Structure 1
Amino acid sequence: PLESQYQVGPLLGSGGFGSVYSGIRVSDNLPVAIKHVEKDRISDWGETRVPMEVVLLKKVSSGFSGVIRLLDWFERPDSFVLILERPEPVQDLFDFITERGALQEELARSFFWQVLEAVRHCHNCGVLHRDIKDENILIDLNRGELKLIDFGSGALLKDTVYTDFDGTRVYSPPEWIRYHRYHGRSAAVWSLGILLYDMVCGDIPFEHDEEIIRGQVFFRQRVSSECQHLIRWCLALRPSDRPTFEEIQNHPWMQDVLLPQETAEIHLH
């Protein structure tokens, strides 16, 4: 009985990924997110079959982390309903950046660092997000913690090649656009490259396929030499030339990161 446990709220937003509503678990007023997904629209199914999101989230969730947790899910004749956690107050990185524009490097460092830990956790649990970007990143405004959301385009992590991709094009790597082929970890680093640039410049670097395959990065804002360096490194044209998660976090620009709470007190409150 879904209609009895949760009290549906306003529509938060929708897309090809389905519709998401705000809500509260009657059981204890816990704020949640209710995601609806029509079966006719699912492209990848996992194991009883279910939408990828459910399989992936079940592999990571367990335990504390920077990934939105799957509280529960229900199957209906023509769709699935996912109960995701919902932090309040909250705002996604997209709206946050659109509001304040370019983020200060100290804040960008704290945020970027949390995303790195989040992604490392996913990969560590055999899950590959495949659509990392500002929209899929939520900010818990009080604790200054970031959450990774929407694993609708994700997949199980593997070391062999990937020939399918249903993520955000402007965030996709040169190898995908030129050969419809890419490897998990490396394509992930590239999108992280776009993300960092988005954070420190207030916008994504490439808009057209030409720009992506050319891989020339131009800065419209003042960014430190080191940050500019880490960004161009993640955006290397040759996948094997990109850094490992370990190399990124060991990067000079990634040192002396702030704690989530500190980040909140200084930049969010």
Structure 2
Amino acid sequence: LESQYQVGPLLGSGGFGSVYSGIRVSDNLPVAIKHVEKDRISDWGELPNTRVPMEVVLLKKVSFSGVIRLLDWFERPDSFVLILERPEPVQDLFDFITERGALQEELARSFFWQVLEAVRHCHNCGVLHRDIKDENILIDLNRGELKLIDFGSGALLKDTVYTDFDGTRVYSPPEWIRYHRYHGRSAAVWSLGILLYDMVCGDIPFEHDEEIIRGQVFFRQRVSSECQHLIRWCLALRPSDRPTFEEIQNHPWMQDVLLPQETAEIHLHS
């Protein structure tokens, strides 16, 4: 039903589908209208009632402003339509880093803290995101709040071992590159290590499988000794040597984070 929603500009497209700017005309709330062709769907879950894309299962399990909320969804002959909340104004973290380069550690601390608190929510809901990166993080520029997006690559969190992966290869851990095996939490800490390096250096540290396997971090920007330690810790080659969400948020570099609105007034011109 596109009598219930008003379609706007095509915000973007790619491996996740095609997302449009939209408005729910009942109350004029800004929304996002995601389209997914059924033939391009990798993983199918099913609601407790019918066969849906696994993204719908995961979204309802985690649907809080750290994770984007799934509002409604429709089934078409050959596509699925998702209705997601849309902040206003927004800029995804990838564009934000492209325009401003390496971020101040106070800003990265706030951004990195919220993502930690955001994926902590996903795991508590039984959801593993499997594609943590700056492209999949939105910045609510008025409130200073980051929202996680794109659950089209995730899975139900499980304590056993994974053997499939349809996420971003430069963010995948070395155990996946060599053995095509990983555990969700430890692989998530690795990608969080890539994400933290990306924020403080302006670009990701690895581009080829050889560097992922070697696990040697070179810093191309001035980074505090504390932030380097936490980054290298998250990027430890053996998964069991990596920190836990608790060990990360107790780290010296993660102390005295700004509140989200504080972050917007100082760093986002709010």
TM-score, scaled relative to structure 1: 0.98
Q: Tell me how far 1:64 sits from its aligned partner.
A: 1.9
Q: Tell me how far 1:21 sits from its aligned partner.
A: 0.6
**8 Å contact kept, 2:193–2:232:** yes
Q: Tell me how far 1:6 sits from its aligned partner.
A: 0.4
Whole-angstrom CA distance in 1 between matches of 2:25 and 2:156 = 33
Whole-angstrom CA distance in 2 between matches of 1:142 and 1:211 = 38
Structure 1: tracts of 5 or more residues without a match: none
Deviates more, 1:99-108 or 1:8-17: 8-17
Q: Tell me how far 1:3 sits from its aligned partner.
A: 1.0
**8 Å contact kept, 2:164–2:180:** yes
**8 Å contact kept, 2:35–2:80:** yes
Percent identical among aligned pairs is 100
Whole-angstrom CA distance in 2 between matches of 1:15 and 1:213 = 28
Q: Tell me how far 1:67 sits from its aligned partner.
A: 0.2
Structure 2: tracts of 5 or more residues without a match: none
Whole-angstrom CA distance in 2 between matches of 1:109 and 1:52 = 32
Whole-angstrom CA distance in 1 between matches of 2:23 and 2:55 = 21
Q: Tell me how far 1:16 sits from its aligned partner.
A: 2.0
Whole-angstrom CA distance in 2 between matches of 1:157 and 1:138 = 23
Could you report, residue by residue, the CA deviation over 1:79-106 in whole angstroms, capped at 9, with x for unpaired residues? 1000000001000000000011000000
**8 Å contact kept, 2:33–2:81:** yes
Secondary structure at 2:3 match in 1: helix
Q: Tell me how far 1:111 sits from its aligned partner.
A: 0.4
Could you report, residue by residue, the CA deviation over 1:133-173 in whole angstroms, capped at 9, with x for unpaired residues? 00000000000000000000000000000000000000000
Could you report, residue by residue, the CA deviation over 1:212-233 in whole angstroms, capped at 9, with x for unpaired residues? 0000000000000000000000
Could you report, residue by residue, the CA deviation over 1:50-77 in whole angstroms, capped at 9, with x for unpaired residues? 11111001001xx623000000000011
Whole-angstrom CA distance in 2 between matches of 1:40 and 1:16 = 13
Secondary structure at 1:227 match in 2: helix
Could you report, residue by residue, the CA deviation over 1:111-133 in whole angstroms, capped at 9, with x for unpaired residues? 00000000000000000000000
Whole-angstrom CA distance in 2 between matches of 1:267 and 1:71 = 30
Could you report, residue by residue, the CA deviation over 1:2-26 in whole angstroms, capped at 9, with x for unpaired residues? 2100001111111122111110001
Secondary structure at 2:135 match in 1: helix
**8 Å contact kept, 2:128–2:154:** yes
Secondary structure at 2:2 match in 1: helix
Q: Let me know the Cα RMSD of the aligned residues.
A: 0.6
Q: Tell me how far 1:261 sits from its aligned partner.
A: 0.3
**8 Å contact kept, 2:65–2:145:** no
Whole-angstrom CA distance in 2 between matches of 1:125 and 1:30 = 26
Secondary structure at 1:135 match in 2: coil
Counterpart residue number, 2:4: 5
Q: Tell me how far 1:181 sits from its aligned partner.
A: 0.4
**8 Å contact kept, 2:186–2:240:** yes
**8 Å contact kept, 2:197–2:203:** yes
Counterpart residue number, 2:125: 125
Whole-angstrom CA distance in 2 between matches of 1:243 and 1:229 = 11
Whole-angstrom CA distance in 2 between matches of 1:43 and 1:149 = 17
Q: How does 1:239-258 map to 2 (within 5 A)?
A: 239-258=239-258
Q: How does 1:60-79 map to 2 (within 5 A)?
A: 60=62, 64-79=64-79
Counterpart residue number, 2:61: 59
Q: Tell me how far 1:264 sits from its aligned partner.
A: 0.3
Secondary structure at 1:194 match in 2: helix
Whole-angstrom CA distance in 1 between matches of 2:175 and 2:79 = 34
Deviates more, 1:181-190 or 1:15-24: 15-24
Shift >3 Å, 4+ stretches? none
Deviates more, 1:45-54 or 1:198-207: 45-54
Could you report, residue by residue, the CA deviation over 1:165-218 in whole angstroms, capped at 9, with x for unpaired residues? 000000000000000000000000000000000000000000000000000000
